[PDB]
Design a binder for this molecule. Sequence first.
Ligand SMILES: CCCC(=O)OC[C@H](COP(=O)(O)O[C@H]1[C@H](O)[C@@H](OP(=O)(O)O)[C@H](OP(=O)(O)O)[C@@H](OP(=O)(O)O)[C@H]1O)O[C@H](O)CCC
Length: 130
Amino acid sequence: GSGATRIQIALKYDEKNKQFAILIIQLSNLSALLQQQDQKVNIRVAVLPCSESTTCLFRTRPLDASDTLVFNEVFWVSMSYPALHQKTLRVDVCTTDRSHLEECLGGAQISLAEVARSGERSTRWYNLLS
Ligand SMILES: CCCC(=O)OC[C@H](COP(=O)(O)O[C@H]1[C@H](O)[C@@H](OP(=O)(O)O)[C@H](OP(=O)(O)O)[C@@H](OP(=O)(O)O)[C@H]1O)O[C@H](O)CCC
C-alpha cells in the first residue's frame, strides 16, 4: 500500500467577520509516508507569507499514527479578502514526541488566489510532497 499520502482540507472565507477558516479534516494512506509506527502525528498549518500583525502558524493536536487519520480541527485567521488572495497555505504532516521537536516529513502548498468571497466552502484532497 504505497502511493501518495493525501490530506483533505476545507477552506471558507467569512466576509461578515473578515476571516478565513481552515478545516484540517483527515489524512489517507499515511502508512506510505511513515517508515516507523506508533508515532504521534500532527499537522502544521502556515499562512504565508507571514503577516506579522496577526498569527500565521497553527498546529493540530497530535494523534497516534493510523493509515487513515481524522483530525477535524478548524483554524480561523483574521484577514481581508484582498490580503487572503495574495497568500499561500502550507500544511505539513509532522511526527512528534516528548521532545516537542517537529519532524515534518512532507506537505502541500495551496495558493489561495482563487478562494471564493461567498462562503460556499471548498473541500479538496491534496497530495503531499517530501
Ligand atoms: C470550514 C467550516 C467550519 C466547520 O464547520 O468545521 C467544523 C467541523 C466540521 O463541520 P461539519 O459538520 O460541517 O463537517 C462534518 C465533518 O467534516 C465530518 O467529517 P468526517 O469525520 O471526515 O467524516 C462528517 O460527518 P460526522 O462524522 O458526523 O462528523 C461530515 O462530512 P460530510 O458533510 O458528509 O461531507 C461533515 O458534515 O467539525 C467537526 O466535524 C467536529 C465534530 C463534532
